């Protein structure tokens, strides 16, 4: 009576993850990227509810490897010092067991070990190494251009619209773009620079609150500005200035949010409590200079909810040129420094904060900052987006004639 | 021109078919040769994907047609539902959540009836 009927142009997505190309408008973007598109290009959807998660996205790793493809072709260090951890002369470790006498005197004496299940030596063994590499060095300029990440053929990038978007949860006002908004490659520990802000109000996140080990991202609505310059009498000295009473209002509404939602406690701010010094300082690259600026006096807002240069707050800042790679593990040396003076006016847009939850008398919570991940600094600009795969084939049982 | 395949999602299926009809009726240096060929590469890739799904419909006797009447009857265990609920109470999401193992089997039976 009525049978199978084939339809083309069928609105059903999937969630496959693919390579997604670039960009908007002479080394990388010439070779890797496309020109712009005449935006606007949006399709508003109606009664859909697409489930968004930010912390399980797979636009992050593609973009992270893509900026690895940027900065080993645009800002080449003179020398790269990377690990080389290998399992000399042989593959003597074999499948498993114990004994095996390698290492001690130089790298070729005997060190017959004992195991019989395995767990690792120097689980299974690795004798590590250090590949040192020298790369060229033209004094190359740098500027993070906006990168409109455009979806390939037969794919879509879904996008939320509500301004209180917590990353997780479902979004109802789901739109569809063909290509993303303005995204700039700005690596910055300790602080977010040149990011896109929020329309309605500030937002506080985590991958997991109460776990006190995931980088709490705070994204602002007030475009706070920052000014690092290099004046003199010294060659490698610089400083930043930030507007006080913009910073008091910003910290006030941040602690207002954190007190109206998650505690219910007392606040206390502090500095990064140690480790490798690219997290203790606000680190950012600007014009070919790797500014490491001290970030103690910004963080003091010990505030019941109810002597440090109170108007022109100065951040003493060193220029260092033997840097730890965020790209992989290891260090890198660049060209010798610059002679002139560099302007680095930028937008403070967010914060990478952590916790140290406890302890029963307190009562307070020590709310030291963190950062150091650069993938976390992409989850704030890969903010709405979800890669979905269309399939336009459908099957419906109609009459048909 | 394949962007607007999904503008009627969330709505029901006959309104989506009418929207398909409406949307189908509605539509000197090295920098030159670098920013010129990738446009043509995207055009050729879109054309080849479209032609790929065109012959994928053409193996079933459905080449070019958005809506085509094929020749495979039911199995009555393929969503034994009244036509009113079929076209007014369920979107596409419920149904390609519902019959995927069955749509593989319908792919096989449409190929077998297409050769004979």
């Amino acid at each position: 009576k009525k049978w199978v009927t084939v339809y083309y142009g069928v609105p059903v997505w999937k969630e496959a993850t693919t390579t997604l190309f670039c960009a908007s408008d002479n080394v990388w973007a010439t070779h890797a990227c496309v020109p712009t598109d005449p935006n606007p290009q949006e399709i508003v959807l109606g009664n859909v509810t697409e489930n968004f998660n930010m912390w399980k996205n797979n636009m992050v790793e593609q973009m992270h490897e893509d900026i690895i493809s940027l900065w080993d072709q645009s800002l080449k260090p003179c020398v790269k010092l990377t690990p080389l951890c290998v399992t000399e002369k042989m593959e003597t470790g074999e499948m498993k067991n114990c004994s095996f006498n390698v290492t001690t005197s130089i790298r070729d004496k005997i060190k017959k070990e004992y195991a019989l299940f395995y767990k690792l030596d120097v689980y299974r063994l690795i004798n590590c190494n250090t590949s040192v590499i020298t790369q060229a060095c033209p004094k190359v300029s740098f500027e993070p251009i906006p990168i409109h990440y455009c979806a390939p053929a037969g794919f879509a990038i879904l996008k939320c619209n509500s301004k209180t978007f917590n990353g997780s949860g479902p979004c109802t006002n789901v739109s569809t773009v063909q290509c993303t908004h303005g995204i700039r490659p700005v690596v910055s520990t300790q602080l977010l620079l040149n990011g896109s802000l929020a329309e309605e109000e500030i937002v506080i996140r985590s991958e997991n609150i109460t776990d006190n080990a995931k980088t709490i991202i705070v994204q602002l609505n007030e475009a706070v500005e920052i000014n690092c310059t290099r004046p003199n009498g010294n060659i490698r000295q610089a400083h930043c200035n930030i507007s006080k009473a913009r910073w008091n209002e910003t910290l006030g509404q941040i602690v207002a949010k954190l007190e109206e939602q998650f505690p219910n406690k007392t606040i206390i701010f502090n500095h990064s409590s140690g480790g490798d010094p690219e997290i203790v300082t606000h680190s950012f690259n600007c014009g070919g200079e790797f500014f490491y600026c001290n970030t103690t006096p910004l963080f003091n807002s010990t505030w019941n909810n109810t002597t440090g240069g109170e108007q022109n707050i100065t951040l003493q800042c060193r220029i260092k040129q033997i840097i730890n790679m965020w790209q992989g593990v290891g260090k890198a040396m660049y060209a010798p420094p610059i002679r002139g003076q560099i302007r680095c006016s930028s937008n403070i847009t967010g914060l990478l904060l952590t916790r140290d939850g406890g302890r029963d008398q307190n009562g307070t919570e020590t709310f030291r900052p963190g950062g150091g991940n650069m993938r976390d600094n992409w989850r704030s600009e890969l903010y709405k987006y979800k890669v979905v795969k269309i399939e336009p084939l459908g099957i419906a049982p109609t009459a048909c004639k | 021109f394949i962007l607007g395949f999904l503008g009627a999602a969330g709505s029901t299926m006959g309104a989506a078919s009418m929207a398909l009809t409406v949307q189908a009726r509605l539509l000197h240096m090295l920098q030159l040769t670098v920013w010129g060929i990738k446009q043509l590469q995207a055009r050729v890739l879109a054309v080849e994907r479209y032609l790929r799904d065109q012959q994928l419909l053409g193996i079933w006797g459905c080449s070019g047609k958005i809506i085509c009447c094929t020749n495979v009857p039911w199995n009555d265990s393929w969503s034994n539902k009244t036509i009113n609920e079929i076209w007014d109470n369920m979107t596409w999401m419920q149904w390609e959540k519902e019959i995927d193992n069955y749509t593989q089997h319908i792919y096989t039976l449409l190929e077998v009836s297409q050769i004979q």
Partner: antibody
Amino acid sequence: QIHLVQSGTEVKKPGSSVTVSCKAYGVNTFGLYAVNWVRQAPGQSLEYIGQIWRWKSSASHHFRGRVLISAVDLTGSSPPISSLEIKNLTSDDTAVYFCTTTSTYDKWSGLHHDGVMAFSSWGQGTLISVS
Amino acid sequence: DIQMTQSPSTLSASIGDTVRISCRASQSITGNWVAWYQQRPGKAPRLLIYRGAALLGGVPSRFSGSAAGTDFTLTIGNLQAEDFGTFYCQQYDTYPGTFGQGTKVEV
């Protein structure tokens, strides 16, 4: 992992109310996860009660008005906690109660059909009897 | 609703049985919106099988099942000492579904 744990085991006088508490460790939030509620008479088959699918609390239609559900997102020092409000304690509501969770994440899982779901993990149940 | 009926309601089985349990439906469930649950006495009735023919990762690879329109078949393969459980079959097609009756296996 999900190590869903409820509150203690009580016993009740008739004609009262009770809020059963189910804590939810290992849960992101109730946007990607939905809380369904089951009861069990001591010696019968299991029995559906309710849902918090996409923050829309609803019990079933044979069981309206008496027992209705609330849910609390993770806050600061608190994991996500679903609570169950039971009115008009009769003599035959004596049962072991269960809270469940499911994954709402992808549409094409098969663990959910428009709020009609299979139940992924399970608590430990609380017995309520009548003196 | 749509009434389910598990059968047989009680059997006994030696160690290493292929126990085949049917679960009847009043309507004809197309799309296979049925799940299989196991409950041992006192603990949590964990899920075994969703969508009729899909095995959960935490459940071992010894359980299976199939569909017969109104019937659904649960199959134990190589019954071990730990799977002596009262079984259940949920229909989760329409709102709200109900479960089976039980199969309390013995020896």
